[PDB]
Amino acid sequence: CPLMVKVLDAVRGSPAINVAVHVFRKAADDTWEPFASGKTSESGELHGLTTEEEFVEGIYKVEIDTKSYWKALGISPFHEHAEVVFTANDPRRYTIAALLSPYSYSTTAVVTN
Amino acid sequence: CPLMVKVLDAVRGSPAINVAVHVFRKAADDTWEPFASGKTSESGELHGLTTEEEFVEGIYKVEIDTKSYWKALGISPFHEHAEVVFTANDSGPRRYTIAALLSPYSYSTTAVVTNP
Amino acid sequence: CPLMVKVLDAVRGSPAINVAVHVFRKAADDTWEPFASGKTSESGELHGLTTEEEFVEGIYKVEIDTKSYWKALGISPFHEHAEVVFTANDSGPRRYTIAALLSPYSYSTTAVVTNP
Amino acid sequence: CPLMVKVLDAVRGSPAINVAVHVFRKAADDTWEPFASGKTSESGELHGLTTEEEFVEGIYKVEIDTKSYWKALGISPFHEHAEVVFTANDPRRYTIAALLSPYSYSTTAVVTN
Ligand SMILES: O=c1cc(-c2ccc(O)c(O)c2)oc2cc(O)cc(O)c12
Numbered sequence: 254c255p256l257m258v259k260v261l262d263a264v265r266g267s268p269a270i271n272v273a274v275h276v277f278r279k280a281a282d283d284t285w286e287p288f289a290s291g292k293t294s295e296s297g298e299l300h301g302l303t304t305e306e307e308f309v310e311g312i313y314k315v316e317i318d319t320k321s322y323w324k325a326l327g328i329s330p331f332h333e334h335a336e337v338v339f340t341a342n343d344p345r346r347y348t349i350a351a352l353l354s355p356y357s358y359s360t361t362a363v364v365t366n
Numbered sequence: 367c368p369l370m371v372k373v374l375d376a377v378r379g380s381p382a383i384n385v386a387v388h389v390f391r392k393a394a395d396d397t398w399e400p401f402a403s404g405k406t407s408e409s410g411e412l413h414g415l416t417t418e419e420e421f422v423e424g425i426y427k428v429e430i431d432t433k434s435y436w437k438a439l440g441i442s443p444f445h446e447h448a449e450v451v452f453t454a455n456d457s458g459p460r461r462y463t464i465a466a467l468l469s470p471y472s473y474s475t476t477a478v479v480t481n482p
Numbered sequence: 483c484p485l486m487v488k489v490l491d492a493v494r495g496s497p498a499i500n501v502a503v504h505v506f507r508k509a510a511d512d513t514w515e516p517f518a519s520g521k522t523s524e525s526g527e528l529h530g531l532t533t534e535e536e537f538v539e540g541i542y543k544v545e546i547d548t549k550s551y552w553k554a555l556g557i558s559p560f561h562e563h564a565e566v567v568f569t570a571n572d573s574g575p576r577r578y579t580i581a582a583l584l585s586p587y588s589y590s591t592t593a594v595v596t597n598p
Numbered sequence: 599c600p601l602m603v604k605v606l607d608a609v610r611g612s613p614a615i616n617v618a619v620h621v622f623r624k625a626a627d628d629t630w631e632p633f634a635s636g637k638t639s640e641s642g643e644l645h646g647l648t649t650e651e652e653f654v655e656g657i658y659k660v661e662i663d664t665k666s667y668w669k670a671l672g673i674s675p676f677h678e679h680a681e682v683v684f685t686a687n688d689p690r691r692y693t694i695a696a697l698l699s700p701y702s703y704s705t706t707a708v709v710t711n
């Protein structure tokens with residue numbers, strides 16, 4: 254699991270469950286092509302998005318559908334989504350973590366091994 | 367002004383100065399159009415991006431060039447940029463302050479929305 | 483003023499108004515002494531806590547009464563308060579802005595330190 | 599493991615390793631008595647601080663020695679430490695997470711089950 258996503262809910266102090274996540278890779282023509290996607294689990298994690306062979310150096314975007322999550326809870330949100338854009342470079346494992354509030358979010362990368 | 371951007375450096379505990387900011391607005395055909403741009407001042411603030419009549423309802427994107435900032439300081443950061451996407455003025459005009467707090471492998475963004 | 487406190491509400495995307503703030507200074511005998519206090523204004527800011535001559539070197543604690551704020555809004559928050567502890571003016575006088583960003587089960591605090 | 603602590607480093611995008619953590623419980627005389635302590639592991643986690651029998655309702659403080667961590671890395675820090683104070687109330691498990699920068703930190707509680 255070279256790439257993992259973890260989402261937390263700052264309002265309820267819990268994992269953010271069933272949040273849609275989309276991963277894109279930047280293409281030569283500079284547009285974003287879909288690469289992988291999923292929903293966070295009960296623990297607010299999304300595993301299995303990709304593999305070591307597949308996850309080559311490049312620029313990647315992770316898009317988290319924050320707005321649907323807040324809508325689900327009946328709380329007005331500010332952001333359309335939360336977007337994280339990064340260069341992967343060459344034995345690393347990437348965890349993209351996000352902490353969510355209706356009017357704020359924080360994202361962090363934990364890069365290890 | 368109805369849109370202001372404020373950037374802070376969590377490493378040095380200072381305003382993040384001379385940070386490029388680009389604003390886009392989603393067009394009818396679903397493309398992003400250039401709306402405004404500028405750089406943060408000595409205070410880490412960017413004022414004067416737009417006006418009340420220009421800043422109509424829509425979906426707006428604020429892209430903060432975090433990578434260039436960190437690189438200029440000798441640091442190779444994780445993120446390409448910090449992007450904030452939002453619907454504006456849906457319920458009538460408001461004043462928006464977009465704040466970003468920057469670290470090399472993390473950032474937080476917050477909106478303060480007030481009623482003119 | 484050399485010490486200012488700014489509080490924001492991450493839920494409502496607004497300044498956190500009428501938030502009690504208490505400041506203490508570590509005494510010679512290692513006890514915390516009352517230094518100053520106040521409440522955040524409509525802008526979420528608290529000014530006028532102290533003066534340049536009063537605000538000498540030392541270790542300072544700023545306790546923000548987050549619990550009362552959330553409770554007044556109907557929310558039972560995780561934290562009792564948000565506490566910020568820091569050495570001040572160790573290298574000569576500085577201006578300190580202590581910022582807090584509040585959510586019911588989370589908070590962030592940041593210091594902006596500038597040279598008068 | 600009713601109580602767990604997780605610390606991350608926002609500068610290096612990594613777990614915050616070997617960070618000292620102290621847990622206190624508020625006593626009737628209103629002072630803090632030491633309850634438990636440890637250092638974060640390689641994964642930036644501290645487990646085994648307490649047990650279900652032991653971890654009764656009360657007000658607890660978790661103190662993270664952020665300043666020593668930054669000193670270890672040669673980076674000037676603002677805070678003396680990061681303090682998290684909370685009421686535990688009654689089948690919960692508590693994870694206290696902290697994200698560290700030299701001039702800023704964020705803490706979040708993930709409370710589950
Ligand atoms: O100093 C300011 C600091 C912040 C701020 C504080 C914490 C954050 O985690 C964040 O993402 C932004 O937000 C502000 C928002 C303001 O309207 C004015 C300010 O001076 C600040």
Ligand SMILES: O=c1cc(-c2ccc(O)c(O)c2)oc2cc(O)cc(O)c12
Nearest residue numbers: 350352359693695696697704705706708
């Ligand atoms: O990677 C983790 C990252 C975070 C986290 C992420 C962002 C924050 O602003 C914060 O304050 C904590 O919280 C976690 C919380 C967990 O329970 C497990 C984890 O692995 C993480």
